[PDB]
């Protein structure tokens, strides 16, 4: 019955009071009255039968989801469908009713150092759960981090999320790439797959430095446009971190090009607490074998007040999911993922 600006948005008799949030990817959000538990929600309505791609990233990011269980990682709740396959049309995913996320929060308001502080905490503590589980998030970005009134922050979006694995990460220079171009590690255009940890610690930092003045650090607007902003901040590697590129290509662009030094960071950021640039630095150092992992980060003196490593939890134990079969198989999956909420 009900419908919110067409869409339909059936959600049976638990959750009433539907209004509008946003457009999700293939979907819409709504906010809207829980019944059972007496509180506002958020609902995720998901469309993705048709389009195989859509399929796999709603089939991952289920998974994980229901096999996550983390304060700074985002719920299911629960996840509403219709009783057979053949009835199954969409999939609502009920989560927690977060206000905003911090990509909306950056256009508006400025951060106090406090705040910054405590959110990158939240973060880093949410990726140490994330990475201890053996996954990669792969699109870290502040559209993907939720916030509430009371500065509880959620990383979101699971959708292009992977098993690590380090032994298969080569790849070619100039190798196509998914996740978002901004906050993509350099390694990826020159030879990267992703399949690394290090991946998700540059985005981080990509992260902060956005937290920091407001503006993403490095906005590329094109592929290769990408690395030339990482370099005219970061300034030409160094011979070691170019010998560890042992592919030809990338390594003889790289040489290609004019010498240029490093913009310091006191420089782009006068105003930052100088161990928040401290860490800054090594979570976006340009040799991904000496980046800073996420342990070692939460563990840097910039976040002193809130490290507490037994209360900063591990997954119990390690993912293994799959990718390529087809649409219909990948609809049987998530029907049998998401049987559990049926009564
Ligand atoms: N738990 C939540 N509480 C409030 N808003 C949410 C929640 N989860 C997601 N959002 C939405 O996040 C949107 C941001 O755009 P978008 O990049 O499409 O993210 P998304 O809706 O999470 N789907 P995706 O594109 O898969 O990340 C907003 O429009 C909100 O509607
Ligand atoms: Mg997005």
């Not at 906050?183 to 290090?198: D, F, H, Q, V």
């Amino acid at each position: 019955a009900a419908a919110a600006g067409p869409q339909v948005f059936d959600v049976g008799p638990r959750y009433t009071n539907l209004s509008y949030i946003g457009e999700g990817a293939y979907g819409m959000v709504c906010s809207a009255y829980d019944n059972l538990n007496k509180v506002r929600v958020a609902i995720k309505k998901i469309s993705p039968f048709e389009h195989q791609t859509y399929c796999q990233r709603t089939l991952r990011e289920i998974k994980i989801l229901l096999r996550f269980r983390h304060e700074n990682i985002i719920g299911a709740n629960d996840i509403i469908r219709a009783p057979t396959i053949e009835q199954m049309k969409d999939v609502y995913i009920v989560q927690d009713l977060m206000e905003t996320d911090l990509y909306k929060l950056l256009k508006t308001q400025h951060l106090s150092n406090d705040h910054i502080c405590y959110f990158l905490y939240q973060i880093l503590r949410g990726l140490k759960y994330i990475h201890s589980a053996n996954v990669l998030h792969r699109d870290l970005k502040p559209s993907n981090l939720l916030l509430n009134t009371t500065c509880d922050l959620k990383i979101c979006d699971f959708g292009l999320a992977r098993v690590a694995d380090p032994d298969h990460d080569h790849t070619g220079f100039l190798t196509e790439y998914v996740a978002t171009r901004w906050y993509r590690a350099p390694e990826i255009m020159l030879n990267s797959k992703g399949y690394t940890k290090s991946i998700d610690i540059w985005s981080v930092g990509c992260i902060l430095a956005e937290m920091l003045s407001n503006r993403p650090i490095f906005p590329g607007k094109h592929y290769l446009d990408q690395l030339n902003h990482i370099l005219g901040i970061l300034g030409s590697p160094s011979q070691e971190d170019l010998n560890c590129i042992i592919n030809l290509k990338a390594r003889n662009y790289l040489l290609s090009l004019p010498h240029k030094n490093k913009v310091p960071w006191n420089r782009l950021f006068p105003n930052a607490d100088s161990k928040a640039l401290d860490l800054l630095d090594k979570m976006l150092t340009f040799n991904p074998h000496k980046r800073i992992e996420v342990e070692q980060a939460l563990a840097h003196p910039y976040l002193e007040q809130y490290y507490d490593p037994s209360d900063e939890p591990i997954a119990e134990a390690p993912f293994k999911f799959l990718d390529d079969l087809p649409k219909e198989k990948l609809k049987e999956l998530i029907f049998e993922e998401t049987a559990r909420f049926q009564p």
